[PDB]
């Protein structure tokens, strides 16, 4: 009944377990809510949809983070500049193009499962959920296999860096990692200019925008956006979604018995886990929006998890149900910026989860205590997830 006392920039808010109670208050009392620091947030599904649908008023050019300015990548652009970038990269992410990767991604899943299946135990986050989407996007970008862990470590350092709650040495670590990624990329530019390859790095390196070559700085940021979209999102729906399947044994069992129930289960895993907790928009004019007066130039946080637990839309959002149908979640956002990777992510989720179901059919949590979550304010999910299963033989 009492107003939440919350800093939406504090990663602890997303990790401590209180967020969904706080969102319930917000959606009932103050749909466009201001936190203890005055930062506006769209908290109801309608408020998020309406802002998404009006980019003239709710611009992306001010930067998607609450505490950082506009940067040279497509997520911080409005149309028509944004669509020009999308047209450079869309072809590699369509459903048809993604479906061409069924065998290739399936082999990565079997490799990873081969690595643990004889042991009867693993850390589902470290051994399964994190590496698979890293390998997929790394192959798309032309990362050598032996370079995947290094890029993944950098990607972790960049997004774990995101909180008002971390010390100024965690801030230098953030900037040092970015500088590392920048020098790596500027060397990739040298290489793909001289020796172009088939992959997404090379396409960005050699791409044109406004009839001049894409800026080296925009190449840094666009490739970074694709990498992190790739390697810091799906991992959390794989681990947090599988957690919920383990906690609802009857649903796990239904899937083991009937793989045709999988597509629906994935949509519920997405809704439940909502890996991307928010994205900002900047007001281009003073307005009144769902009864909150908003000032030109301030940001508003689109709260996707809050929208995804909106009772007026889902009826019973607090039950996890693989049979939820339809499942109109906005884990991937909505509108012109609607997730580029969303078919890639769904196919990663399908192919891995099917192999886990088939090959580790008595999977369980090592203990049913809460799974620890990353206290960061942008992307977050399970930090680790020890699991156990009856050992079995490798397949590849």
Ligand X SMILES: CC(C)CCC[C@@H](C)[C@H]1CC[C@H]2[C@@H]3CCC4=CC(=O)CC[C@]4(C)[C@H]3CC[C@]12C
Positions touching ligand HEM (CB under 6 A) are 52, 74-75, 86, 137, 225-226, 229-230, 233-234, 237, 270, 275-276, 279, 304, 331-335, 337-341, 344-345
Q: Which stretch binds ligand X (CB under 6 A): 22-30, 48-56, 224-232, 323-331?
A: 224-232
Helix (H, G, I), strand (E, B) or coil at 51: helix
* Min dist. Cβ of residue 5 to ligand HEM (A): 26
For residue 259 the two structure tokens come to 């793989």
Residue 113 near residue 359, CB atoms below 8 Å: yes
**Binding partner at 86 among ligand X, ligand HEM, none, C-beta below 5 to 8 Å by kind:** ligand HEM
Residue 87 near residue 208, CB atoms below 8 Å: no
Could you give the string, one character per residue 169-208, with x where binding to ligand X holds by CB under 6 A and - elsewhere?
-----x---x------------------------------
- Judged by CB under 6 A, does residue 224 bind ligand X? yes
339 in a known ligand binding site: yes
- Judged by CB under 6 A, does residue 158 bind ligand X? yes
Residue with tokens 């800026």: 215
* Min dist. Cβ of residue 145 to ligand X (A): 22
* Min dist. Cβ of residue 268 to ligand X (A): 21
In DSSP terms, 276 is beta-bridged to: 379
Q: Provide DSSP, 335-382.
A: GGG--TTHHHHHHHHHHHHHHHHHHSTT-EESS-SPPPB---SSB--B
Residues in the interface with ligand X (CB under 6 A) total 13
Nearest residue (CB) to ligand HEM, 177 versus 342 = 342
Q: How far is CA 53 from the centre of its chain?
A: 21
Q: Which stretch binds ligand X (CB under 6 A): 15-23, 44-52, 111-119, 228-236?
A: 228-236
Out of 29, 37, 68, 384, point to the residue binding ligand X (CB under 6 A): 68
Rounded to 5 degrees, what angle do the CA atoms 147, 153, 159 make?
A: 135
Q: Provide DSSP, 162-198.
A: --SSS-HHHHHHHHHHHHHHHHHHHHHHHHHHHS--S
- Judged by CB under 6 A, does residue 233 bind ligand X? yes
Out of 19, 228, 330, 385, point to the residue binding ligand X (CB under 6 A): 228
Residue 164: closest CA among 45, 52, 11, 321: 11
**Binding partner at 226 among ligand HEM, ligand X, none, C-beta below 5 to 8 Å by kind:** ligand HEM
Calculate the alpha carbon distances from 274 to 19, 262, 324, 395 in Å. 12, 18, 16, 32
The annotation places the binding site at 339
Contacts with ligand X by CB under 6 A lie at 65, 68, 158, 174, 178, 224-225, 228-229, 232-233, 276, 379
């Amino acid at each position: 009944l009492t107003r939440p006392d919350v800093d939406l920039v504090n990663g602890m808010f997303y990790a401590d377990g209180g967020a969904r109670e706080a969102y319930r208050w917000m959606r009932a009392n103050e749909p466009v809510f201001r936190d203890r620091n005055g930062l506006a947030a769209a908290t109801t599904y309608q408020a998020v949809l309406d802002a998404e649908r009006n980019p003239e008023l709710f611009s992306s050019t001010g930067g998607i983070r609450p505490d950082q300015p506009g940067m040279p990548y497509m997520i911080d652009m409005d149309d028509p500049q944004h669509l020009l970038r999308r047209k450079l990269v869309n072809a590699g992410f369509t459903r048809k193009r993604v479906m061409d990767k069924v065998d290739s991604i399936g082999r990565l899943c079997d490799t990873l499962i081969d690595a643990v299946c004889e042991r009867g135990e693993c850390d589902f986050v470290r051994d399964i959920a994190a590496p698979l989407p890293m390998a997929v996007i790394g192959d798309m970008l032309g990362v050598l296999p032996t370079e995947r862990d290094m890029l993944l470590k950098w990607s972790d350092d960049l997004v774990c860096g995101l909180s008002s709650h971390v010390d100024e040495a965690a801030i230098q670590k953030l900037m040092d990692t970015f500088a590392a990624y920048t020098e790596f990329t500027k060397d990739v530019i040298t290489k793909r200019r001289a020796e172009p390859t088939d992959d997404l790095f090379s396409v960005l390196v050699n791409s044109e925008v406004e009839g001049q070559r894409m800026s080296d700085d925009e190449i840094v940021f666009e490739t970074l956006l694709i990498l992190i979209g790739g390697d810091e999102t799906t991992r959390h729906t794989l681990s947090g979604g599988t957690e919920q399947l383990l906690r609802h044994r009857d649903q796990w069992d239904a899937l083991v018995a009937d793989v045709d129930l999988l597509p629906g289960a994935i949509e519920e895993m997405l809704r439940w886990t909502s890996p991307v907790k928010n994205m900002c928009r900047t007001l281009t004019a003073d307005t009144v929006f769902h009864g909150t007066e908003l000032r030109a130039g301030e940001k508003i946080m689109l709260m996707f998890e809050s929208a995804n637990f909106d009772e007026s839309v889902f009826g019973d959002p607090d039950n996890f149900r693989i049979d939820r149908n339809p499942n109109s979640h906005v884990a991937f956002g909505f509108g012109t910026h609607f997730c580029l990777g969303n078919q890639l992510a769904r196919l990663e989720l399908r192919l891995m989860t099917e192999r886990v179901l088939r090959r580790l059919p008595d999977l369980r949590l090592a203990d049913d205590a809460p799974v620890p979550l990353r206290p960061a304010n942008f992307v977050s999910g399970p930090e680790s997830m020890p699991v156990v299963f009856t050992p079995s033989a490798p397949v590849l």
